[PDB]
Amino acid sequence: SGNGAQGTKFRISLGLPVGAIMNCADNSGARNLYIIAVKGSGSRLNRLPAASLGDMVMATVKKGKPELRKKVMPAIVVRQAKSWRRRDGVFLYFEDNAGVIANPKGEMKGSAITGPVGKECADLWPRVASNSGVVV
Amino acid sequence: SHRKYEAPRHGHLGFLPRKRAASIRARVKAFPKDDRSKPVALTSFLGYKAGMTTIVRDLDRPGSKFHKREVVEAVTVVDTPPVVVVGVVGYVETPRGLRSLTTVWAEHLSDEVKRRFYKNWYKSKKKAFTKYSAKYAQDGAGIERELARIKKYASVVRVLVHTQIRKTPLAQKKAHLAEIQLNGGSISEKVDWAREHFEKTVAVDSVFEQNEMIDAIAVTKGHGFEGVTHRWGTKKLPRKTHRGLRKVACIGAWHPAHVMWSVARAGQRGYHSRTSINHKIYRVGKGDDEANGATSFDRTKKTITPMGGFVHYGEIKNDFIMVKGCIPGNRKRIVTLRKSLYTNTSRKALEEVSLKWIDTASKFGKGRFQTPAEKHAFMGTLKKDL
Amino acid sequence: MKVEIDSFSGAKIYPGRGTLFVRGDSKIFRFQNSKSASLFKQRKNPRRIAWTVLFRKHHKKGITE
RNA sequence: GAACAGCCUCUAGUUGAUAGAAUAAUGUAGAUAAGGGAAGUCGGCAAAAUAGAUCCGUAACUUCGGGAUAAGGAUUGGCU
RNA sequence: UCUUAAGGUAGCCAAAUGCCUCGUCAUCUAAUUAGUGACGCGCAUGAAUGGAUUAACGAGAUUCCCACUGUCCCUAUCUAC
RNA sequence: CAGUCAAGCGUUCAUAGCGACAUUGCUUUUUGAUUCUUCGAUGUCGGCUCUUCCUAUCAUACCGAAGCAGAAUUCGGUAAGCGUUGGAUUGUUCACCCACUAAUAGGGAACGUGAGCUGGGUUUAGACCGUCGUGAGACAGGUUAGUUUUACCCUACUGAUGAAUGUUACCGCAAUAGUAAUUGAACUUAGUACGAGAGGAACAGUUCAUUCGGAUAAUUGGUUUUUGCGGCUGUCUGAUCAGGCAUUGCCGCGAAGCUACCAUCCGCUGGAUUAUGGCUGAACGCCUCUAAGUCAGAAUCCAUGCUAGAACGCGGUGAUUUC
């Protein structure tokens, strides 16, 4: 996302195209995040912009407290649930897709993470790592 | 009118016609540029693609966010018994190109190479190079004169080599014969090297070395006739499509009133000559010892061959090379390893690679053990073990 | 490198081979292959699956080790 | 089995449809598919999901007759 | 005041009927020429050329939601002919 | 769409950027005008798919000019090499919003493309409404339902054989044809250059990543007629054991093969140039990048590479038929 993105990430297998609804892993009052676009996505005809672990996306709250609903916010994917390959050859996956609301810089609206967070996402976003309990 | 939305074309226009290769063995199209200062040396080698396996190695990339950590990589193991050089041909430069002036063979020719020269070998008189050896079989009868011709002419010198199909576990019995350029010393030095190396084996540990970028030249795996969707990657037509959806919808405009060469059409897929470049040698090993798959960290006595042998291939009791990644062609196929046409640093070609562990588990399923000793230790005693 | 123990079948997992699963409880489950993964996701008990190391230990099988 | 449902069998009848050769592309018919879940498309078109039976529970509205199998949930084998 | 025979009453409406028009406001969405609710100087609604409403019913015509899925991202594989 | 002149606008400072009055053109992506071809039929809108071409260049390469300070920007040159997206609404071309992006540039190819698809709309017959008609009926007014046929011929294209330079075999050459890679981010440079301060760049570097392409199946995931193993229902084989049948009976694993940016690997460096900036140097005793000569220089071109190998283009080499 520019200033807030601390480093680069290796290629993580995409598992969240546009229209995907993931759980909301922070305590901002939102329950799910619906992905409307992915930052840094490429342009291919008919190809859906797909999010991966640690990616920043544009999201809308479909279920949650009304103040977050009916508007677009940045979000960061913290769990993918779609198997991706790390550098050490391990194919790992989570139980569910999950993300956290954040500002365009990268600062979360919430102060804690409910559940585990991927190591790639934690390395990309230090504040997500700071508010995350378990990093895998 | 214009396309409503732009999109890149499907497929590469520099790789057609997508036709079958002229031969099973893929020749080196261009040899590396000649240098006279360097010693005479083979610029290529002929191996047989044994299979694929997995390695573990510490990545040394000074600046990567995940540097000095263990990584898992896929490597290709090719069985490379030492190629027998016999014969040498000369090429004079003409306003028409390199023209072959003469080829001089050696005294004894192997049965496998004569089988290569033959088609119905079993129902034959085996009359091949007999009168050639009669012209030969003396000290200075008529072969030294041809050598002098190649020295006085033939600005390019290419030695002739054949593989050890008998040493390899193939059921072919027919040697593969090719030319390898000598890119060192003068023409006299090249011819002297070829004559001294006449009728004998050259080892790939002498040709190539560890931590080297080379090119694999091979014919890809054949897949027969194929439709456009998998041959070129075009879109699948919608479900409600009359008379077929695995097709290209529009194959041309009204004008020009012809199907154009650039339109994707169904046809042969695979079995194409290909030259892939920048493959890093992860190991050059020999089969005249155990612990071929053993490293300084694993130090477990085991050969490269997985449990039950390489699937569809067998055992690698010869000399072998494990290069990084995949190479064109499938198992049991002859591949030509050529020295790189250029010298690049890139902080990736000079990276010294030290292997930690090589996957030797069975590739014939989800293999759990790497050695029969380890398998027996884990499982204990069985009913069949007395 | 290091080898592992399958969270279901109790088998050394070599690098590259197998898969890893992270439950909602943030518990790591390493599976040697799709067979063990599928059994775990079907929620079959390793102590009742006959070929598992847990089964052998529970049934006192192969005590010669 | 609720059942002249579907499935297997007894009596009776037939074994009739040009054949042979491990089958390439594209088809016709039947099917699976990781993650997402209509982002496809004029449109959820076609497929999928649901489904029997026994219990629990069942809203607005209503012409009080319905809605209603509303919606939702739980069990179902074998043996003694 | 002109004016007809009377000058559209009760109702309803951008309705399958509204040209302008993708009417205006609200809601539904991140975004809606769609949908619903509301407003009517209604080109050109309207009372057995029946008006308005309506439970139940409909292989009728639109909108949204849950579930579900190869419709799609993005295709792959299998069988029979 | 583009020129010419310059009254003016640009805080005094016509043409940095615009520019009235006027005037000169170009363009066949608009709509008119015409009726030349077609009424013993050239299948009619839109979308999907796919290829190529144009440049009047949105982005990317290198530059020139600013009311260019830096950072964004604006004008222009070479330049079509390479890209130009995902969606809500609408049958929609066109639109208008949400976003992403380097950008979301404009067009042609019988208003490209229906024996390629679809049939949402127009565009038969059924039906409803409003207005108009006494009526039958009319309405580029609204609404609903409404058969989309044929390739096996020729050519074109995609692949595949193949007679005939004595035969046969091996190893090659390379004319010609094609060609490919592309874009961004982060760390350092650097809170530096610049700036009153706010703000705030380029790197020769290093790591990744969109987009495209060629392969490959070590691993992971997918597929199951391995009908391989096991389990289950109904029925039949007297019971067991073992099986048959149920369009492959159903379920769980399931090797091998195939396959996925759903997996992995790989995708080269030299010369000549355009714009432009220069050297020497006149025409024109000075000046001048130009007249002669000449230096550097673009994602450009041509080669190095890569694909095919002329089936009427070739070379070398082995053997070449006792009754």
UniProtKB/Swiss-Prot annotation, chain A:
Modified residues (N-acetylserine): 1
Keywords, ordered alphabetically: Acetylation, Cytoplasm, Methylation, Ribonucleoprotein, Ribosomal protein
PTM-bearing positions, type N6,N6-dimethyllysine: 105, 109
Subcellular compartments: Cytoplasm
Signal peptide (from-to): none
GO cellular component: cytosol; cytosolic large ribosomal subunit
CDD domains tied to this protein: Ribosomal_uL14 (cd00337)
Main subcellular location of this protein, as a coarse class: cytoplasm
Database matches in Pfam families: Ribosomal_L14
GO biological process: cytoplasmic translation
GO molecular function, one term: large ribosomal subunit rRNA binding
InterPro entries named among the record's database cross-references: Ribosomal_uL14 (IPR000218), Ribosomal_uL14_CS (IPR019972), Ribosomal_uL14_sf (IPR036853)
Gene3D superfamilies, per the entry: Ribosomal protein L14
Post-translational modification: Methylated by RKM1 at 2 different sites, but it is unclear which are the 2 methylated residues among Lys-39, Lys-105 and/or Lys-109.
Database matches in HAMAP family: Ribosomal_uL14
Miscellaneous remark of the record: There are 2 genes for uL14 in yeast.
Family (UniProt): Belongs to the universal ribosomal protein uL14 family.
Subunit annotation: Component of the large ribosomal subunit (LSU). Mature yeast ribosomes consist of a small (40S) and a large (60S) subunit. The 40S small subunit contains 1 molecule of ribosomal RNA (18S rRNA) and 33 different proteins (encoded by 57 genes). The large 60S subunit contains 3 rRNA molecules (25S, 5.8S and 5S rRNA) and 46 different proteins (encoded by 81 genes).
Protein purpose: Component of the ribosome, a large ribonucleoprotein complex responsible for the synthesis of proteins in the cell. The small ribosomal subunit (SSU) binds messenger RNAs (mRNAs) and translates the encoded message by selecting cognate aminoacyl-transfer RNA (tRNA) molecules. The large subunit (LSU) contains the ribosomal catalytic site termed the peptidyl transferase center (PTC), which catalyzes the formation of peptide bonds, thereby polymerizing the amino acids delivered by tRNAs into a polypeptide chain.
Protein's recorded name: Large ribosomal subunit protein uL14A
Organism: Saccharomyces cerevisiae (strain ATCC 204508 / S288c)
From Swiss-Prot, chain B:
Modified-residue entries (Pros-methylhistidine), positions: 242
Record cross-link Glycyl lysine isopeptide (Lys-Gly) (interchain with G-Cter in ubiquitin), residues: 38, 135
A GO cellular-component term linked to this record: cytosol
Changes seen on gene knockout: A mutant confers resistance to trichodermin, a trichotecene toxin produced by plant-pathogenic fungi.
GO BP term, pick one: maintenance of translational fidelity
UniProt PTM comment: Methylation at His-242 by HPM1 is required for proper 60S subunit assembly and promotes translational elongation fidelity.
Pfam short name (any one): Ribosomal_L3
Main location, first listed in the record: cytoplasm
Modified sites of kind Phosphothreonine: 102
Localization annotation: Cytoplasm
Modified residues (Phosphoserine): 23, 155, 296
Record key words, sorted: Cytoplasm, Isopeptide bond, Methylation, Phosphoprotein, Ribonucleoprotein, Ribosomal protein, Ubl conjugation
Molecular function in Gene Ontology: RNA binding; structural constituent of ribosome
InterPro entries registered for this protein in UniProt: L3_arc_euk, Ribosomal_L3_dom_3_arc_sf, Ribosomal_uL3, Ribosomal_uL3_CS, Transl_B-barrel_sf
Additional remarks: Present with 450 molecules/cell in log phase SD medium.
Subunit structure: Component of the large ribosomal subunit (LSU). Mature yeast ribosomes consist of a small (40S) and a large (60S) subunit. The 40S small subunit contains 1 molecule of ribosomal RNA (18S rRNA) and 33 different proteins (encoded by 57 genes). The large 60S subunit contains 3 rRNA molecules (25S, 5.8S and 5S rRNA) and 46 different proteins (encoded by 81 genes). uL3 forms together with ES39L one of the contact sites for the signal recognition particle that targets ribosomes to the endoplasmic reticulum membrane.
Family assignment from sequence similarity: Belongs to the universal ribosomal protein uL3 family.
PANTHER family named among the record's database cross-references: 60S RIBOSOMAL PROTEIN L3-RELATED, LARGE RIBOSOMAL SUBUNIT PROTEIN UL3
Record protein name field: Large ribosomal subunit protein uL3
Protein species of origin: Saccharomyces cerevisiae (strain ATCC 204508 / S288c) (Baker's yeast)
Gene name for this UniProt entry: RPL3
Curated annotation (Swiss-Prot), chain C:
Membrane-crossing segments per the record: none
Domain of life: Eukaryota
Protein name: Large ribosomal subunit protein eL24A
Keywords: Cytoplasm, Phosphoprotein, Ribonucleoprotein, Ribosomal protein
GO molecular function: mRNA binding; RNA binding; structural constituent of ribosome
Assembly and oligomerization: Component of the large ribosomal subunit (LSU). Mature yeast ribosomes consist of a small (40S) and a large (60S) subunit. The 40S small subunit contains 1 molecule of ribosomal RNA (18S rRNA) and 33 different proteins (encoded by 57 genes). The large 60S subunit contains 3 rRNA molecules (25S, 5.8S and 5S rRNA) and 46 different proteins (encoded by 81 genes).
Coverage span on the entire protein: 1 to 65 of 155
Record has Magnesium as a keyword: no
Family: Belongs to the eukaryotic ribosomal protein eL24 family.
Residue(s) carrying Phosphoserine: 7
Biological process terms in GO annotation: cytoplasmic translation; translational elongation; translational initiation
Gene: RPL24A
Job description of the protein: Component of the ribosome, a large ribonucleoprotein complex responsible for the synthesis of proteins in the cell. The small ribosomal subunit (SSU) binds messenger RNAs (mRNAs) and translates the encoded message by selecting cognate aminoacyl-transfer RNA (tRNA) molecules. The large subunit (LSU) contains the ribosomal catalytic site termed the peptidyl transferase center (PTC), which catalyzes the formation of peptide bonds, thereby polymerizing the amino acids delivered by tRNAs into a polypeptide chain.
Additional comment: Present with 247000 molecules/cell in log phase SD medium.
Subcellular compartments: Cytoplasm
GO cellular component, one term: cytosol
